[PDB]
Amino acid sequence: TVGPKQAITSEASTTYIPSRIYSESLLFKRQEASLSAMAFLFQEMISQLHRTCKTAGDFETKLSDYGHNIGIRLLELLNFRASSSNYITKMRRRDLKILDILQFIHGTLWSYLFNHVSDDLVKSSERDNEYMIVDNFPTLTQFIPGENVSCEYFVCGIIKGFLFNAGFPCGVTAHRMPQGGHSQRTVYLIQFDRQVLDREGL
Amino acid sequence: IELLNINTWLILQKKILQLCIKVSRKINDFEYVAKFSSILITKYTHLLNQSEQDALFKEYIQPSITNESITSYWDPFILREVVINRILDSDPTSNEIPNPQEVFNPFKRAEFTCRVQNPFKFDFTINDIQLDEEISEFCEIDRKAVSYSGPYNVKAESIRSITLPLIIKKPTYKKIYEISCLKISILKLPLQKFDIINDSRRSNPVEEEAE
Amino acid sequence: GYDYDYLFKIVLIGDSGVGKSNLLSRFTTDEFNIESKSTIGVEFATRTIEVENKKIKAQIWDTAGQERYRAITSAYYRGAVGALIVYDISKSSSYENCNHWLTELRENADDNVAVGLIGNKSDLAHLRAVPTDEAKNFAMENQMLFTETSALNSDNVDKAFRELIVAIFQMVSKHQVDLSGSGTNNMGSNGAPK
Amino acid sequence: RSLKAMGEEIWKNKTEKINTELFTLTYGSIVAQLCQDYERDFNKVNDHLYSMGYNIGCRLIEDFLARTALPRCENLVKTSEVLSKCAFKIFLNITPNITNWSHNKDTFSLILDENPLADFVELPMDAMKSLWYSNILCGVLKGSLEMVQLDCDVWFVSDILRGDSQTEIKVKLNRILKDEIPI
Amino acid sequence: MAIETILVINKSGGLIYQRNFTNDEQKLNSNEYLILASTLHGVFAIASQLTPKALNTIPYIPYVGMDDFFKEPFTNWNKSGLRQLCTDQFTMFIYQTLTGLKFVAISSSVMNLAIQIADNFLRKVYCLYSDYVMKDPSYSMEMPIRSNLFDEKVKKMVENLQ
Amino acid sequence: PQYFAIIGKKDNPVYEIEFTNAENPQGFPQDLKELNPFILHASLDIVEDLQWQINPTTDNCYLGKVDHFYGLAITAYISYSGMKFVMIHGNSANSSVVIDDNNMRSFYQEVHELYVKTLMNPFYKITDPIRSPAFDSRVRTLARKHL
């Protein structure tokens, strides 16, 4: 009963100091876990989404929604704790060019979820509006056997909801290019829409 | 009304088309004051008070009521369910109708025939405009099985009984058809099939028993 | 190679001399080795069928009753998912402990099994120890598949056993969707910038 | 030497390491969608989190028994010693202690100090009575201990997400002595 | 010591995995392995029940496979049960887990220390089982091991042995 | 008087408040009913236009007085998620946000913790208002102590 959408509550300033009900904290406090306890919950994502899905494509694009609802949380956290609350600091750059947020995702999102920075970030040289991001080892899909890459898409929805809430409407698609002795190389191609494309030209 | 996607924020949408009602009042256009009074039904859920400009908006409704057909009952969400419970006459006459192989397969994963009985109806009005009135509800393309008398109102918010429908039917053959809803007139002309929420919420009659 | 999808184990249980092994050896294709019954006890033959575009191996384990293998056979019902109590209509004392086999097999087999009941030796039709309608009824309030299982010139088993693998299949055929793997793009000359 | 000091050697080297904030976020996404597609029927989502968690523990007991090679526990107080010092210390990073046994050592309770699955959650008001958020552990500890043929039954009783005093989990174990042939 | 064939049988009799690698031939490969695996489960049951009027198992770390999987002496879990067959051409080891999941290793190198080097390999195949087959949502329980990552995760460790 | 609002992605509001001095207790006299949401929704657009400008009309988070209309200035803050923290200031004379420009940057940044802290609840979707009793005390103690 604070913001109803029926009205704007009109309340006078400089009232009393009220009681304190719930107080949280926001710094990182780098607490670890075991990769088995992650991979068990990832296979319990997939062991229900195999059950309540009829074809492949809607399984793809509702495994992606779980990643969407981690990406739109994580975008507001990572810049805000990288620019550093009551230890008052400035407000990061708030990046607004497509190869200034790709450097941020490439060097900080993958260094946040995973221990290492992702290795390469590859422009599609022979055309425009495709932007590859690769690694050498997807450490969440690494217990899936076979070759079909539907089980990839929980990480790629983390990418897409990172950009869709950043003002950059895109669409990701994952593929597998087994280059060299890295048999699981697993490119994602970020593929921005047409209606964004004029705006960074002007 | 094109600049806001009306057909998001809500308070301004209410305030702009309240201004549109007042300008179409001062112009005395009728078809737009009927139209915006009818397109306020997307927003009576939130944003309103309990019968202050519902009644001071009913004084904009009721000029369009006393004109020709310019409103035609905005909301098709009226009657939650209809029950055709045959009352108890007598239990003297229910008058009904009529090795080798073969391996067992254990591992393997209503209609009425009504009589001299009356039915029931009940419904609600969605919003706190007072004293909404209805007359003469009856069935659609069906047989003789209709009601008679209609003196009823409905109150502010409540889910109200409609007593005394008093059905009288003629006997047919037992061809099994489904009804859903009836032709109900809410203080004006008889509108169409005011269907039921969340499901069609069927009913299943057959013939009257002449036996 | 191997290339089947699921593998069920199905016990054949009953009294001795009710005719289970002769019922088996017509019916499974073979087991490639005659071997022996009573050296380890229970013997086992395979049968492959396919259900619902999945390929099934079913492993029939028929169990002997020589009174020596007391703890041994009770260890052999561990993990047993399909079951078949066999009884003969000629003799009568097997039916007195068909319910004994049923309550021993509801014990310690799985969480849920699918037990069939089969009347061997219908060829001697003029010697019925127990009426078929009583055993049919006793199958009806015990959720059991019932077949005549007549001996010689019969298929009662070739439809009832397939129906048993169907009912045990949808007891464990949970869910899957697709393994198509057709999504390919991105063949460039890599103007990378890290 | 013992069970208190043995598990942090396993925690020190050769345990593949991930954060816990991604673990909280990817649990929270599951339970938010399970709320939204069951139309806020909160005694159904406790059933569904139970049936999800029961199929974790049958896969998890083989990973725990391969990572450390325990014997079978001799008494139920030392099952609780494993579940204190070497179950949640290896897989998670938490050591929830034990209080309040029964009058005959039939039940016990498990005070969980900090939860690595609800770091941010303030659950809604219609879920304030009929939902237990970290029910996934009560699918796991029913599951894995059933594969050791300790038929226990495990519920929540109170938790801090409701606004109550403390998170604690009551274990009541019934029956055993049925299993594979060698011991 | 040496291993020539990995056989992994279930907790309910019939097998879920075998690979007779470096056979340098085409051996017999059908349901005879199923009846062999069920025969080993049966004689593993029978070797419990006979025991005379009598009424250990501390391995070590020998660094098999070249960080490794474990560091410390441990225990076994089966005493009244079959442990090692010994013949002229081969020698068969077997290893029961606590949950009931027996691992069978046929060995083409013949003639007590072979137990010590054997079970420190048969626990290192158990760790790859629990790491690469348990976290597999396409793998249901009670089904053959149709994963293709489990083959060339164990092939590297056995050719690192021999 | 002061008007403060958190405007969402589709321009739907998620927090809506005014707070004002006790000299004029019924604040914003015949503007709070009829101009105060219109000037907010109208002057979202220059804040939206300033979100893609590198230099204004090397921080790009705080924005100054972006509009001045009948002597009422508004100030803005564009969050990474794009939720914009626009706030209208009203007075008797010509109000100055320049006397608080060093100050209330740590009022916009102080709300970040209050916001980001209410984003991390997984039950909280986007495009629904903040029905939080904790949030009101957490914003009005900040408004009382730091203005």
Side-chain angles (χ1 to χ4, degrees), chain A residues 2 19-24, chain D residues 122, chain F residues 114 130-141:
Chain A
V2 163
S19 186
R20 304 306 292 257
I21 308 106
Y22 192 34
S23 167
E24 302 98 305
Chain D
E122 181 199 327
Chain F
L114 262 331
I130 309 185
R131 294 179 67 188
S132 178
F135 212 70
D136 208 2
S137 72
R138 287 317 170 110
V139 66
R140 68 183 68 188
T141 52

Side-chain angles (χ1 to χ4, degrees), chain C residues 1-178 181 183 188 191-193:
Chain C
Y2 286 95
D3 66 48
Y4 46 84
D5 268 10
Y6 292 166
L7 187 153
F8 303 125
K9 67 182 291 294
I10 295 171
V11 286
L12 294 174
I13 190 181
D15 275 2
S16 158
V18 310
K20 41 182 84 154
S21 314
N22 43 297
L23 172 66
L24 183 140
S25 179
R26 44 210 300 271
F27 155 83
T28 90
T29 153
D30 194 343
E31 44 165 346
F32 292 166
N33 0 70
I34 164 39
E35 244 348 61
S36 88
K37 191 116 92 107
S38 296
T39 51
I40 62 170
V42 173
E43 64 91 9
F44 40 70
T46 80
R47 166 68 170 255
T48 186
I49 69 157
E50 84 296 328
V51 191
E52 275 170 82
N53 304 57
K54 298 293 188 71
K55 198 163 73 68
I56 301 299
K57 182 63 66 68
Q59 198 185 51
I60 310 176
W61 293 33
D62 52 345
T63 299
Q66 294 177 335
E67 294 293 328
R68 160 173 73 254
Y69 311 124
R70 296 294 86 193
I72 298 306
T73 61
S74 77
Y76 280 43
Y77 314 109
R78 190 67 53 167
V81 69
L84 265 170
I85 306 196
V86 60
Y87 85 114
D88 56 332
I89 62 170
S90 306
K91 209 190 81 204
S92 178
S93 66
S94 65
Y95 203 80
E96 181 294 334
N97 71 301
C98 275
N99 62 6
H100 186 273
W101 295 131
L102 198 47
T103 182
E104 190 276 332
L105 183 62
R106 282 301 198 280
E107 207 160 68
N108 74 353
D110 207 357
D111 62 357
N112 189 359
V113 293
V115 183
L117 187 75
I118 176 163
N120 203 24
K121 291 176 221 141
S122 33
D123 166 38
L124 283 281
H126 62 288
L127 318 210
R128 210 137 94 211
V130 177
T132 76
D133 304 271
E134 205 270 338
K136 191 160 142 59
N137 175 80
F138 176 62
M140 287 207 159
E141 67 272 14
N142 278 98
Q143 299 96 18
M144 294 177 71
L145 150 63
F146 181 69
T147 312
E148 183 178 2
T149 299
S150 154
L152 293 158
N153 215 343
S154 31
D155 69 357
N156 276 267
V157 289
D158 291 331
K159 70 177 186 70
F161 178 71
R162 165 86 184 234
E163 196 266 359
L164 182 59
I165 304 180
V166 175
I168 208 178
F169 183 49
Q170 292 84 18
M171 183 179 72
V172 309
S173 161
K174 41 174 68 171
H175 63 278
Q176 213 54 45
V177 64
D178 201 333

Side-chain angles (χ1 to χ4, degrees), chain E residues 44-55:
Chain E
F44 190 72
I46 281 175
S48 73
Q49 210 195 349
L50 62 84
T51 293
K53 309 294 146 283
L55 277 296

